[PDB]
Every structure is written in C-alpha cells, then in structure tokens.
C-alpha cells in the first residue's frame, strides 16, 4: 500500500518522554501541537500516489486549513526555528512541504510507501518539520522523522 493524496492519515513522530519512546500525533485547531482532529490529507493542488521529492500541501481535516511554515519564531527557544501553524491562504510557498526519504534504501522520484519514515522540508524556509520540547512542532535545521498511518 503506497501513500496517496486525499487519503486521510495520522502523522506521527517518536518522542522520548520519561526515557520512554512513544508515537505522537500532529494536531491543530493558531499554531500546531502534538498528542497521544489529528486527521490530515496530503494534497498536490488547491488520490494520486506520492513520490519522494514531490512538494505537497498538508490539509488539516477538521479545520480545512493548511500546515504552513510562518515568519515568526515565538513558539521556540531556538530563534533559528520558525513557527508552524494553520493558514487558510495557500498562494505562495509557505504551505508547501517536500517529502524525502529517511533512508538510503529509498530514492527521489520513487513511490512513497506507508510505513516509510519521512522527512518533510519546507519549501519557503528550507527547514524541516521538527519535533521540539511540552512537545511542539516547528520548522528547524534539525531533522525529525515522520511516519504516516491510515485513519
């Protein structure tokens, strides 16, 4: 089963809480946060299979808004990371993310499988969608690995 646009997914990263790893889910309601309204769909325009190096939108299902890298750096105590949040507007590059493999055992232009560990690169700011500690998401120079499950 490959990953496709319009398929409702949960977007997860591993966090190391009490020296204990668990899978956390991206959520939102105007910035983004983590939990475990966690439902997302990949899109290519305002159910095609996604390829690595494809730029995509992440549409939040409850709200209908998109995950966009912001200007501001207010959620972070690293001032080189940008805030990530929901935006209704989708002209410009800020709501766009390119998908990359975690592993060398996956190539650019290849089909993105479910259960593939993913790296998500902001088109406008060239930063990664990034897990930060509470736990939040920002856009930073350090990579975080994301995986997608069906929901």
Short mmCIF file of N, CA and C in Angstrom, two decimals:
data_model
loop_
_atom_site.label_atom_id
_atom_site.label_comp_id
_atom_site.label_asym_id
_atom_site.label_seq_id
_atom_site.Cartn_x
_atom_site.Cartn_y
_atom_site.Cartn_z
N UNK A 1 0.84 -1.23 0.00
CA UNK A 1 0.00 0.00 0.00
C UNK A 1 0.87 1.26 0.00
N UNK A 2 0.76 2.06 -1.05
CA UNK A 2 1.52 3.31 -1.10
C UNK A 2 0.74 4.46 -0.47
N UNK A 3 1.45 5.54 -0.16
CA UNK A 3 0.81 6.76 0.27
C UNK A 3 0.24 7.51 -0.94
N UNK A 4 -0.94 8.10 -0.76
CA UNK A 4 -1.63 8.83 -1.83
C UNK A 4 -2.23 10.10 -1.29
N UNK A 5 -2.46 11.08 -2.16
CA UNK A 5 -3.19 12.31 -1.80
C UNK A 5 -4.63 11.95 -1.47
N UNK A 6 -5.33 12.86 -0.79
CA UNK A 6 -6.73 12.67 -0.37
C UNK A 6 -6.99 11.49 0.60
N UNK A 7 -5.97 10.69 0.91
CA UNK A 7 -6.15 9.62 1.89
C UNK A 7 -5.88 10.20 3.25
N UNK A 8 -6.83 9.99 4.16
CA UNK A 8 -6.78 10.53 5.50
C UNK A 8 -5.77 9.76 6.31
N UNK A 9 -4.87 10.52 6.90
CA UNK A 9 -3.75 9.91 7.60
C UNK A 9 -3.55 10.56 8.93
N UNK A 10 -2.91 9.79 9.80
CA UNK A 10 -2.36 10.28 11.03
C UNK A 10 -0.85 10.47 10.79
N UNK A 11 -0.31 11.58 11.29
CA UNK A 11 1.08 11.91 11.07
C UNK A 11 1.84 11.88 12.38
N UNK A 12 2.79 10.95 12.47
CA UNK A 12 3.40 10.61 13.73
C UNK A 12 4.92 10.82 13.75
N UNK A 13 5.43 11.14 14.92
CA UNK A 13 6.85 11.11 15.18
C UNK A 13 7.05 10.40 16.52
N UNK A 14 8.25 9.89 16.75
CA UNK A 14 8.60 9.29 18.03
C UNK A 14 9.19 10.37 18.94
N UNK A 15 8.68 10.45 20.17
CA UNK A 15 9.23 11.33 21.18
C UNK A 15 9.71 10.47 22.36
N UNK A 16 10.69 10.97 23.09
CA UNK A 16 11.30 10.25 24.20
C UNK A 16 10.99 11.00 25.46
N UNK A 17 9.82 10.69 26.01
CA UNK A 17 9.29 11.34 27.21
C UNK A 17 10.08 10.97 28.51
N UNK A 18 9.61 9.99 29.28
CA UNK A 18 10.27 9.62 30.54
C UNK A 18 11.51 8.72 30.38
N UNK A 19 12.28 8.92 29.31
CA UNK A 19 13.25 7.90 28.81
C UNK A 19 12.49 6.73 28.14
N UNK A 20 11.24 7.01 27.78
CA UNK A 20 10.32 6.05 27.17
C UNK A 20 9.88 6.62 25.83
N UNK A 21 10.07 5.86 24.76
CA UNK A 21 9.63 6.35 23.47
C UNK A 21 8.16 6.09 23.27
N UNK A 22 7.48 7.07 22.72
CA UNK A 22 6.14 6.87 22.19
C UNK A 22 5.86 7.66 20.92
N UNK A 23 4.87 7.19 20.17
CA UNK A 23 4.45 7.83 18.93
C UNK A 23 3.49 8.98 19.21
N UNK A 24 3.83 10.18 18.75
CA UNK A 24 2.95 11.35 18.89
C UNK A 24 2.35 11.77 17.56
N UNK A 25 1.15 12.35 17.67
CA UNK A 25 0.32 12.74 16.53
C UNK A 25 0.23 14.24 16.38
N UNK A 26 0.49 14.70 15.17
CA UNK A 26 0.34 16.10 14.86
C UNK A 26 -1.15 16.45 14.94
N UNK A 27 -1.43 17.61 15.51
CA UNK A 27 -2.77 18.13 15.64
C UNK A 27 -2.72 19.65 15.52
N UNK A 28 -3.90 20.27 15.59
CA UNK A 28 -4.08 21.73 15.43
C UNK A 28 -5.54 22.07 15.61
N UNK A 29 -5.83 23.37 15.73
CA UNK A 29 -7.19 23.87 15.89
C UNK A 29 -7.38 25.12 15.03
N UNK A 30 -2.80 30.58 16.21
CA UNK A 30 -3.33 29.37 15.56
C UNK A 30 -2.23 28.40 15.10
N UNK A 31 -1.44 27.93 16.07
CA UNK A 31 -0.24 27.11 15.83
C UNK A 31 -0.51 25.60 15.98
N UNK A 32 0.49 24.78 15.62
CA UNK A 32 0.38 23.32 15.70
C UNK A 32 0.97 22.70 16.97
N UNK A 33 0.46 21.53 17.34
CA UNK A 33 0.88 20.82 18.55
C UNK A 33 0.80 19.29 18.44
N UNK A 34 1.13 18.57 19.52
CA UNK A 34 1.21 17.10 19.49
C UNK A 34 0.38 16.44 20.56
N UNK A 35 0.00 15.18 20.35
CA UNK A 35 -0.85 14.47 21.30
C UNK A 35 -0.64 12.95 21.27
N UNK A 36 -1.24 12.26 22.25
CA UNK A 36 -1.15 10.81 22.46
C UNK A 36 0.10 10.40 23.22
N UNK A 37 -9.40 15.26 14.84
CA UNK A 37 -8.55 16.48 14.92
C UNK A 37 -7.01 16.24 14.73
N UNK A 38 -6.62 14.97 14.75
CA UNK A 38 -5.29 14.56 14.33
C UNK A 38 -5.30 14.08 12.87
N UNK A 39 -6.37 14.36 12.13
CA UNK A 39 -6.51 13.85 10.76
C UNK A 39 -5.99 14.80 9.69
N UNK A 40 -5.19 14.26 8.78
CA UNK A 40 -4.56 15.05 7.73
C UNK A 40 -4.75 14.35 6.36
N UNK A 41 -4.68 15.15 5.30
CA UNK A 41 -4.62 14.64 3.94
C UNK A 41 -3.48 15.34 3.22
N UNK A 42 -2.67 14.58 2.50
CA UNK A 42 -1.72 15.17 1.59
C UNK A 42 -2.44 15.66 0.34
N UNK A 43 -2.03 16.81 -0.18
CA UNK A 43 -2.52 17.24 -1.49
C UNK A 43 -1.48 17.83 -2.41
N UNK A 44 -1.83 17.93 -3.69
CA UNK A 44 -0.90 18.46 -4.66
C UNK A 44 -1.39 19.76 -5.25
N UNK A 45 -2.66 20.05 -5.04
CA UNK A 45 -3.23 21.28 -5.52
C UNK A 45 -4.31 21.77 -4.56
N UNK A 46 -4.60 23.06 -4.67
CA UNK A 46 -5.79 23.69 -4.12
C UNK A 46 -7.04 23.04 -4.76
N UNK A 47 -6.78 10.81 -5.75
CA UNK A 47 -5.90 10.08 -4.84
C UNK A 47 -4.64 9.60 -5.57
N UNK A 48 -3.81 10.54 -6.01
CA UNK A 48 -2.58 10.20 -6.72
C UNK A 48 -1.50 9.72 -5.76
N UNK A 49 -0.66 8.79 -6.21
CA UNK A 49 0.43 8.29 -5.38
C UNK A 49 1.49 9.36 -5.26
N UNK A 50 2.05 9.49 -4.07
CA UNK A 50 3.05 10.50 -3.81
C UNK A 50 4.41 9.90 -4.09
N UNK A 51 5.28 10.71 -4.69
CA UNK A 51 6.67 10.32 -4.94
C UNK A 51 7.59 11.18 -4.07
N UNK A 52 8.75 10.65 -3.71
CA UNK A 52 9.71 11.45 -2.97
C UNK A 52 10.16 12.63 -3.83
N UNK A 53 10.31 13.79 -3.19
CA UNK A 53 10.74 15.00 -3.88
C UNK A 53 9.58 15.80 -4.45
N UNK A 54 8.38 15.21 -4.38
CA UNK A 54 7.14 15.92 -4.62
C UNK A 54 6.88 16.91 -3.52
N UNK A 55 6.43 18.10 -3.89
CA UNK A 55 6.00 19.11 -2.95
C UNK A 55 4.52 18.93 -2.71
N UNK A 56 4.09 19.07 -1.47
CA UNK A 56 2.70 18.82 -1.16
C UNK A 56 2.15 19.81 -0.15
N UNK A 57 0.83 19.83 -0.08
CA UNK A 57 0.11 20.52 0.97
C UNK A 57 -0.28 19.46 2.01
N UNK A 58 -0.37 19.88 3.27
CA UNK A 58 -0.98 19.06 4.30
C UNK A 58 -2.22 19.75 4.82
N UNK A 59 -3.37 19.24 4.40
CA UNK A 59 -4.63 19.86 4.75
C UNK A 59 -5.12 19.25 6.05
N UNK A 60 -5.41 20.11 7.02
CA UNK A 60 -5.98 19.64 8.28
C UNK A 60 -7.47 19.44 8.07
N UNK A 61 -7.99 18.24 8.37
CA UNK A 61 -9.38 17.87 8.02
C UNK A 61 -10.47 18.54 8.83
N UNK A 62 -10.28 18.68 10.15
CA UNK A 62 -11.30 19.30 11.00
C UNK A 62 -11.52 20.75 10.58
N UNK A 63 -10.43 21.46 10.33
CA UNK A 63 -10.46 22.90 10.08
C UNK A 63 -10.60 23.24 8.60
N UNK A 64 -9.95 22.42 7.76
CA UNK A 64 -9.89 22.69 6.33
C UNK A 64 -8.73 23.60 5.97
N UNK A 65 -7.95 24.03 6.97
CA UNK A 65 -6.77 24.87 6.75
C UNK A 65 -5.48 24.04 6.51
N UNK A 66 -4.39 24.72 6.14
CA UNK A 66 -3.16 24.03 5.75
C UNK A 66 -2.00 24.26 6.71
N UNK A 67 -1.09 23.30 6.78
CA UNK A 67 0.07 23.43 7.65
C UNK A 67 1.11 24.25 6.91
N UNK A 68 1.38 25.43 7.46
CA UNK A 68 2.25 26.41 6.84
C UNK A 68 3.36 26.78 7.81
N UNK A 69 4.56 26.90 7.27
CA UNK A 69 5.70 27.47 7.97
C UNK A 69 5.52 29.01 8.05
N UNK A 70 5.56 29.57 9.27
CA UNK A 70 5.32 31.01 9.45
C UNK A 70 6.61 31.84 9.43
N UNK A 71 6.48 33.17 9.49
CA UNK A 71 7.67 34.02 9.62
C UNK A 71 8.19 33.91 11.04
N UNK A 72 7.41 34.44 11.97
CA UNK A 72 7.71 34.44 13.40
C UNK A 72 8.43 33.21 13.98
N UNK A 73 9.22 33.45 15.03
CA UNK A 73 9.83 32.40 15.85
C UNK A 73 9.47 32.57 17.33
N UNK A 74 8.18 32.51 17.64
CA UNK A 74 7.75 32.74 19.03
C UNK A 74 7.49 31.48 19.87
N UNK A 75 7.19 30.35 19.23
CA UNK A 75 7.00 29.09 19.95
C UNK A 75 8.31 28.45 20.41
N UNK A 76 9.43 29.02 19.99
CA UNK A 76 10.72 28.34 20.10
C UNK A 76 11.73 29.13 20.90
N UNK A 77 12.53 28.41 21.68
CA UNK A 77 13.69 28.98 22.32
C UNK A 77 14.96 28.71 21.51
N UNK A 78 14.79 28.25 20.27
CA UNK A 78 15.81 28.35 19.23
C UNK A 78 15.29 29.37 18.22
N UNK A 79 15.98 30.50 18.06
CA UNK A 79 15.48 31.58 17.20
C UNK A 79 15.80 31.37 15.73
N UNK A 80 16.42 30.25 15.40
CA UNK A 80 16.60 29.88 14.01
C UNK A 80 15.52 28.91 13.56
N UNK A 81 14.56 28.61 14.43
CA UNK A 81 13.45 27.76 14.00
C UNK A 81 12.26 28.66 13.74
N UNK A 82 11.46 28.35 12.73
CA UNK A 82 10.24 29.12 12.52
C UNK A 82 9.05 28.41 13.13
N UNK A 83 8.06 29.19 13.54
CA UNK A 83 6.74 28.73 13.96
C UNK A 83 6.05 28.03 12.81
N UNK A 84 5.31 26.97 13.15
CA UNK A 84 4.42 26.26 12.21
C UNK A 84 2.94 26.38 12.63
N UNK A 85 2.05 26.68 11.68
CA UNK A 85 0.64 26.82 12.04
C UNK A 85 -0.33 26.59 10.90
N UNK A 86 -1.63 26.73 11.19
CA UNK A 86 -2.68 26.63 10.16
C UNK A 86 -2.97 27.94 9.42
N UNK A 87 -3.01 27.88 8.10
CA UNK A 87 -3.32 29.05 7.28
C UNK A 87 -4.45 28.73 6.28
N UNK A 88 -5.36 29.67 6.09
CA UNK A 88 -6.42 29.50 5.11
C UNK A 88 -5.86 29.77 3.71
N UNK A 89 -4.97 30.75 3.61
CA UNK A 89 -4.36 31.13 2.33
C UNK A 89 -3.29 30.15 1.88
N UNK A 90 -3.23 29.90 0.58
CA UNK A 90 -2.30 28.92 0.06
C UNK A 90 -1.60 29.33 -1.24
N UNK A 91 -1.68 30.61 -1.58
CA UNK A 91 -0.78 31.16 -2.59
C UNK A 91 0.56 31.33 -1.88
N UNK A 92 1.66 31.23 -2.63
CA UNK A 92 3.00 31.31 -2.06
C UNK A 92 3.49 29.92 -1.69
N UNK A 93 4.72 29.86 -1.19
CA UNK A 93 5.42 28.62 -0.94
C UNK A 93 5.32 28.13 0.52
N UNK A 94 4.84 29.01 1.41
CA UNK A 94 4.85 28.74 2.86
C UNK A 94 4.06 27.49 3.36
N UNK A 95 3.00 27.12 2.64
CA UNK A 95 2.18 25.95 2.98
C UNK A 95 2.67 24.66 2.33
N UNK A 96 3.76 24.76 1.57
CA UNK A 96 4.28 23.64 0.79
C UNK A 96 5.47 22.93 1.43
N UNK A 97 5.44 21.61 1.36
CA UNK A 97 6.44 20.76 2.02
C UNK A 97 6.89 19.72 1.03
N UNK A 98 8.19 19.49 0.93
CA UNK A 98 8.67 18.44 0.06
C UNK A 98 8.99 17.19 0.89
N UNK A 99 8.69 16.03 0.34
CA UNK A 99 8.84 14.76 1.06
C UNK A 99 10.14 14.09 0.67
N UNK A 100 10.91 13.67 1.67
CA UNK A 100 12.19 12.99 1.43
C UNK A 100 12.33 11.73 2.25
N UNK A 101 13.06 10.74 1.71
CA UNK A 101 13.24 9.51 2.50
C UNK A 101 14.18 9.75 3.68
N UNK A 102 13.92 9.05 4.77
CA UNK A 102 14.87 8.96 5.85
C UNK A 102 16.08 8.13 5.37
N UNK A 103 15.82 6.98 4.75
CA UNK A 103 16.87 6.01 4.48
C UNK A 103 17.41 6.06 3.07
N UNK A 104 18.65 5.59 2.91
CA UNK A 104 19.27 5.43 1.60
C UNK A 104 18.60 4.32 0.81
N UNK A 105 17.87 3.46 1.52
CA UNK A 105 17.07 2.41 0.89
C UNK A 105 15.74 2.97 0.36
N UNK A 106 15.72 4.28 0.07
CA UNK A 106 14.62 4.89 -0.66
C UNK A 106 15.09 6.11 -1.47
N UNK A 107 14.61 6.23 -2.71
CA UNK A 107 15.15 7.21 -3.66
C UNK A 107 14.16 8.28 -4.12
N UNK A 108 14.72 9.42 -4.52
CA UNK A 108 13.99 10.55 -5.06
C UNK A 108 13.33 10.21 -6.39
N UNK A 109 12.03 10.47 -6.47
CA UNK A 109 11.24 10.06 -7.62
C UNK A 109 10.58 8.71 -7.43
N UNK A 110 10.95 7.97 -6.39
CA UNK A 110 10.30 6.69 -6.07
C UNK A 110 8.97 6.88 -5.30
N UNK A 111 8.11 5.87 -5.38
CA UNK A 111 6.83 5.86 -4.67
C UNK A 111 7.06 5.91 -3.16
N UNK A 112 6.25 6.70 -2.47
CA UNK A 112 6.33 6.79 -1.02
C UNK A 112 5.42 5.70 -0.45
N UNK A 113 5.99 4.74 0.26
CA UNK A 113 5.19 3.69 0.92
C UNK A 113 4.66 4.11 2.28
N UNK A 114 3.57 3.47 2.70
CA UNK A 114 3.09 3.63 4.06
C UNK A 114 4.09 2.84 4.92
N UNK A 115 4.46 3.39 6.06
CA UNK A 115 5.48 2.75 6.89
C UNK A 115 6.87 3.20 6.50
N UNK A 116 6.96 4.12 5.54
CA UNK A 116 8.22 4.79 5.24
C UNK A 116 8.44 5.94 6.22
N UNK A 117 9.65 6.01 6.78
CA UNK A 117 9.99 7.11 7.66
C UNK A 117 10.27 8.33 6.75
N UNK A 118 9.61 9.44 7.02
CA UNK A 118 9.65 10.55 6.10
C UNK A 118 10.31 11.75 6.69
N UNK A 119 10.92 12.54 5.82
CA UNK A 119 11.49 13.84 6.18
C UNK A 119 10.75 14.87 5.34
N UNK A 120 10.30 15.93 5.99
CA UNK A 120 9.44 16.95 5.42
C UNK A 120 10.15 18.32 5.44
N UNK A 121 10.35 18.87 4.24
CA UNK A 121 11.15 20.06 4.06
C UNK A 121 10.27 21.17 3.58
N UNK A 122 10.23 22.25 4.36
CA UNK A 122 9.51 23.47 3.99
C UNK A 122 10.10 24.10 2.74
N UNK A 123 9.25 24.32 1.75
CA UNK A 123 9.67 24.95 0.50
C UNK A 123 10.13 26.39 0.68
N UNK A 124 9.44 27.15 1.51
CA UNK A 124 9.80 28.55 1.66
C UNK A 124 11.03 28.76 2.55
N UNK A 125 11.14 27.99 3.63
CA UNK A 125 12.20 28.28 4.61
C UNK A 125 13.33 27.26 4.62
N UNK A 126 13.18 26.18 3.85
CA UNK A 126 14.18 25.12 3.74
C UNK A 126 14.53 24.44 5.06
N UNK A 127 13.59 24.45 5.99
CA UNK A 127 13.78 23.85 7.29
C UNK A 127 12.96 22.58 7.30
N UNK A 128 13.25 21.71 8.26
CA UNK A 128 12.47 20.50 8.48
C UNK A 128 11.28 20.73 9.38
N UNK A 129 10.18 20.03 9.13
CA UNK A 129 9.12 19.88 10.14
C UNK A 129 9.74 19.10 11.27
N UNK A 130 9.63 19.62 12.49
CA UNK A 130 10.62 19.30 13.52
C UNK A 130 9.93 19.18 14.84
N UNK A 131 10.29 18.13 15.58
CA UNK A 131 9.71 17.91 16.90
C UNK A 131 10.52 18.68 17.91
N UNK A 132 9.85 19.47 18.74
CA UNK A 132 10.58 20.26 19.72
C UNK A 132 9.93 20.16 21.12
N UNK A 133 10.73 20.15 22.18
CA UNK A 133 10.18 20.26 23.53
C UNK A 133 10.24 21.71 24.07
N UNK A 134 6.47 20.14 27.69
CA UNK A 134 5.63 20.13 26.49
C UNK A 134 6.38 19.78 25.19
N UNK A 135 5.61 19.30 24.21
CA UNK A 135 6.11 18.96 22.89
C UNK A 135 5.37 19.74 21.81
N UNK A 136 6.14 20.34 20.91
CA UNK A 136 5.57 21.07 19.79
C UNK A 136 6.31 20.81 18.51
N UNK A 137 5.71 21.27 17.43
CA UNK A 137 6.31 21.23 16.15
C UNK A 137 6.74 22.64 15.72
N UNK A 138 7.92 22.73 15.12
CA UNK A 138 8.37 23.96 14.49
C UNK A 138 9.07 23.60 13.18
N UNK A 139 9.70 24.58 12.54
CA UNK A 139 10.44 24.34 11.30
C UNK A 139 11.90 24.70 11.59
N UNK A 140 12.78 23.69 11.59
CA UNK A 140 14.15 23.87 12.11
C UNK A 140 15.21 23.26 11.22
N UNK A 141 16.48 23.56 11.49
CA UNK A 141 17.57 22.95 10.74
C UNK A 141 17.83 21.49 11.09
N UNK A 142 17.23 20.99 12.16
CA UNK A 142 17.43 19.58 12.55
C UNK A 142 16.29 18.71 12.05
N UNK A 143 16.62 17.55 11.53
CA UNK A 143 15.57 16.67 11.06
C UNK A 143 14.81 15.91 12.16
N UNK A 144 13.53 15.73 11.90
CA UNK A 144 12.68 14.81 12.65
C UNK A 144 12.10 13.83 11.63
N UNK A 145 11.94 12.58 12.05
CA UNK A 145 11.35 11.54 11.20
C UNK A 145 9.85 11.35 11.42
N UNK A 146 9.07 11.42 10.34
CA UNK A 146 7.64 11.30 10.41
C UNK A 146 7.23 10.00 9.71
N UNK A 147 6.15 9.42 10.21
CA UNK A 147 5.56 8.27 9.57
C UNK A 147 4.07 8.50 9.55
N UNK A 148 3.47 7.88 8.56
CA UNK A 148 2.07 8.04 8.29
C UNK A 148 1.37 6.71 8.48
N UNK A 149 0.24 6.78 9.19
CA UNK A 149 -0.71 5.67 9.31
C UNK A 149 -2.10 6.07 8.77
N UNK A 150 -2.86 5.10 8.22
CA UNK A 150 -4.25 5.35 7.79
C UNK A 150 -5.18 5.60 8.97
N UNK A 151 -6.12 6.53 8.77
CA UNK A 151 -7.13 6.86 9.77
C UNK A 151 -8.47 7.10 9.10
#
